[PDB]
């Protein structure tokens, strides 16, 4: 019937699925039909308004996420599509679904945990990335302990799911600049301790993507304090220098981008300057020959700049 009726029926069928065969087959068919009916409402401006209000009030939005594993293949995608549409609802300047989730945070924790269930992981990723577009929801996820679960997810043996988790992880770290910069600063030690492990991943993809994201993070103006701290640690310089000799050409190239940051720094700590001086002639020679086959031009100009930087390295006043 109306939005309220569809919401009531869907809530009842969901209840049956949680409780088979005859009864289960009917409830699954009824769930599928109601989800399709809800989509038809989305595509009466007040009908949509009514559906949203009923969705918040009844707790059905939350139930659809909690029970996603129980829903059929196409039905799971319909939940994602409905959720993604309702999430963007606006009333004047307000986004009611975002305010709603801020007081219903378990929706986010359940979606995150969903990465651990093969049959719902990608749909959870889709909904999570839509949530992440809203700074308050990105914040809840980023400050949560569950954020560290991404370090496990991107190292998962099922590479497609690991790649999807990485896209979510990257979005969280790069979309809201001030928010990400404040997070990285406040949890610097734990975050980089975990990230350092990604740079040794056996999944060549996770490793390459992790090195590329590190470069992007260090170069954003909002992350200046984090960058300054990262390029002050001998162990980080060591790792980047060793990656310049990685068996993978792409890895070496991504490592070169971070390496440049360490060298361009006008105020190096002594442990950093000492490593560069200890390898000065070797670095000059190495850079003069580094992937000289590669015509990038921006790359060639960077090598010219780094060779001069290394040649000009000097100990300051004691």
């Amino acid at each position: 019937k109306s939005p309220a009726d569809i919401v009531k029926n869907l809530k009842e069928s969901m209840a049956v699925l949680e409780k088979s065969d005859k009864k289960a087959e009917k409830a699954t068919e009824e769930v599928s039909k109601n989800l399709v009916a809800m989509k038809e409402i989305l595509y009466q401006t007040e009908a949509v308004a009514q559906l949203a209000q009923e969705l918040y009030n009844s707790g059905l939005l939350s139930t659809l996420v909690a029970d996603l594993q129980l829903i059929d293949f196409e039905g799971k995608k319909d939940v994602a599509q409905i959720f993604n549409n309702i999430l963007r609802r606006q009333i004047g300047t307000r986004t009611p679904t975002v305010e709603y989730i801020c007081t219903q945070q378990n929706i986010l924790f359940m979606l995150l945990k969903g990465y651990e269930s093969p049959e719902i992981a990608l749909n959870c990723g889709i909904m999570l990335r839509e949530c992440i577009r809203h700074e308050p929801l990105a914040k809840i996820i980023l400050w949560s302990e569950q954020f560290y679960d991404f370090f496990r997810y991107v190292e998962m043996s099922t590479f497609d799911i690991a790649s999807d988790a990485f896209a979510t992880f990257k979005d969280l770290l790069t979309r809201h600049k001030l928010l990400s910069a404040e997070f990285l600063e406040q949890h610097y030690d734990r975050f980089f301790s975990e990230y350092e492990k990604l740079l040794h991943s056996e999944n060549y993809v996770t490793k390459r993507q992790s090195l590329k994201l590190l470069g992007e993070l260090l170069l954003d103006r909002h992350n200046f304090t984090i960058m300054t701290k990262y390029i002050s640690k001998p162990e980080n310089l060591k790792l980047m220098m060793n990656l310049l000799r990685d068996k993978s050409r792409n890895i070496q190239f991504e490592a070169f981008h971070v390496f440049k940051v360490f060298v361009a720094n006008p105020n190096k700590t002594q442990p950093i300057l000492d490593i560069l001086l200890k390898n000065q002639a070797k670095l000059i020679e190495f850079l003069s020959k580094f992937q000289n086959d590669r015509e990038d031009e921006q790359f060639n100009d960077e090598k010219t700049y780094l060779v001069k930087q290394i040649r000009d390295l000097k100990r300051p006043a004691q």
Binding site: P234, K238, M241, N242, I275, K278, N279, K282
Partner: peptide, 4 residues
């Protein structure tokens, strides 16, 4: 090799 590099020397650290």
């Amino acid at each position: 090799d590099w020397e650290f």
